[PDB]
Design a protein around this ligand. Structure first.
Ligand code: LJ6
Ligand code: ZN
Ligand code: ZN
Ligand code: ZN
Length: 459
């Protein structure tokens, strides 16, 4: 059962206001025919326009919420809303566009999906709360057939052009007019009581209902993200590499080792409380410190309450030494902390919009992360950039310009002139640091942290 069988039953109750008289007994096979499409017994990679919840979760990067509202149905204008915030008005003759015929609306749909999805996914998944008009509008901008490849590259085709009779992926679709072989899922098939707004609002206060199709589209996608990544979590599902995932993860390991090592050298904490991932490894294996681990999986809904992590009776004394929260998101960090906290507001191809201000960070696995909150860091300060090294000054083995920097904490800088090895290492470390920060990570530290305390570790 890899794909959704076309013979699966589709519940039609949510469609009967736009389509009165619709049969209660309905399959996807009959629904697709009703929508004006013909599948023609084709075993050519596209068995169904609709997909399972499991297939949708694997393709979360392709999710585009889509709603269609009657402005006044072949005789009336339709308002097409997308989770990108775009509203297009199509005439049968929060960005709002005036009424235009389908032949020009379809060109805009292809451009919008292509610009949104080219760096995210090889397809589009329209996330619906299906009431009828959205399904009956698909024939005006969607074409289906066998799975195809792009005319300018090896990627699967996502667009079709009636002008040249050619197919293209999202990267080569300029001037194309039809969406080709899209996928879709109706959230209303999962079992819900009441309307979209009532189900959405139970879990989210960030998306309002300004009474336009894009608002419904955003709410629909947000509800689907809630059901698949907030209430239900799956860290076994792997997502493909689309950007700087590897460099970011390597940079995070590099920065964690640097900051913790320097905090231990500078303040000589006798104990470190490492709170978070139950599979964590000591990030500074050679440190003298008593290293104590506390297990907590990533919180996907609300940030952990510090009172629940630390209290209810273990070292017990979390006030002794220092606490390390490396992506362990809590409501309020204690004053004696070293923290790495993901900023959900960051714009990136890895960070997708999420539920209630949270974001869906997709890097190898999907992590719904609670909304960034500046008040979590009230007992701490921002950690400044610095590079520390006690490794010997020796090159071994890329042309040079001498490094001058007050934040290169090395024996050679203490001595007055940074060596080639430490200049190369400082520049590689600065690039890794900038990669981590630009990915959305934020670093915070106990207020007494002072890099001036590292200079005397060179005796
Ligand atoms: C946890 C967590 N909190 O915010 C984000 C973002 C993550 C996930 C990320 C750090 C990651 O790649 N992990 C754990 C393997
Ligand atoms: Zn292409
Ligand atoms: Zn929402
Ligand atoms: Zn040196």
């Amino acid at each position: 059962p890899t794909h959704l069988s076309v013979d699966t039953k589709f519940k039609t109750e949510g469609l009967c206001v736009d389509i009165p008289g619709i049969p209660k007994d309905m399959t996807y096979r009959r629904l697709i025919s009703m929508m004006g499409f013909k599948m023609n017994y084709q075993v050519n990679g596209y068995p169904n326009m609709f997909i399972t919840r499991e297939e949708a979760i694997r393709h979360v990067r392709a999710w585009i919420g889509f709603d269609v509202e009657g402005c006044h149905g072949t005789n009336l204008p339709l308002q097409l809303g997308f989770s990108t915030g775009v509203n297009l008005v199509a005439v049968p003759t929060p960005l709002m566009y005036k009424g235009l015929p389908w032949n020009v609306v379809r060109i805009k749909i292809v451009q919008m999906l292509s610009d949104t999805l080219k760096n995210l996914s090889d397809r589009v998944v329209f996330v619906l709360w299906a009431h009828g008009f959205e399904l009956t509008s698909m024939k005006y901008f969607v074409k289906i057939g066998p799975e195809r490849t792009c005319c300018l590259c090896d990627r699967r085709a996502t667009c079709f052009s009636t002008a040249s009779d050619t197919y293209a992926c999202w990267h080569h679709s300029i001037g194309f007019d039809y969406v080709y072989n899209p996928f879709m899922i109706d959230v209303q098939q999962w079992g819900f009581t009441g309307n979209l707004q009532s189900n959405h609002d139970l879990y989210c206060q960030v998306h309002g209902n300004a009474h336009v199709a894009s608002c419904d589209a955003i709410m629909t996608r947000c509800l689907a993200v809630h059901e698949c990544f907030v209430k239900r979590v799956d860290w076994t599902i792997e997502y493909p590499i689309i950007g700087d995932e590897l460099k970011i993860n390597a940079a995070c390991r590099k920065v964690q080792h640097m900051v913790v090592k320097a905090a231990l050298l500078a303040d000589k904490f006798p104990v470190l409380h490492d709170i978070g991932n139950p599979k964590a490894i000591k990030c500074v294996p050679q440190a003298d410190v008593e290293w104590k681990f506390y297990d907590a999986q990533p919180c996907s809904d609300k940030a952990y309450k510090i009172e629940e992590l630390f209290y209810s009776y273990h070292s017990d004394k979390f006030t002794d030494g220092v606490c390390l929260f490396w992506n362990c998101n809590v409501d309020r960090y204690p004053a004696n902390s070293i923290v790495c906290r993901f900023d959900t507001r960051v714009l990136s191809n890895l960070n997708l919009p999420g539920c209630d201000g949270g974001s869906l960070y997709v890097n190898k696995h999907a992590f719904h992360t609670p909304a960034f909150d500046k008040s979590a860091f009230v007992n701490l300060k921002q950690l400044p950039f610095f590079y520390y090294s006690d490794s010997p000054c020796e090159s071994h083995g890329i042309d040079y310009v001498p490094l001058k920097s007050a934040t290169c904490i090395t024996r050679c800088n203490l001595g007055g002139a940074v060596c080639r090895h430490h200049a190369n290492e400082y520049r590689l470390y600065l690039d890794a640091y900038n990669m981590m920060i630009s990915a959305g990570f934020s670093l915070w530290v106990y207020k007494q942290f002072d890099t001036y305390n590292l200079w005397n570790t060179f005796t």
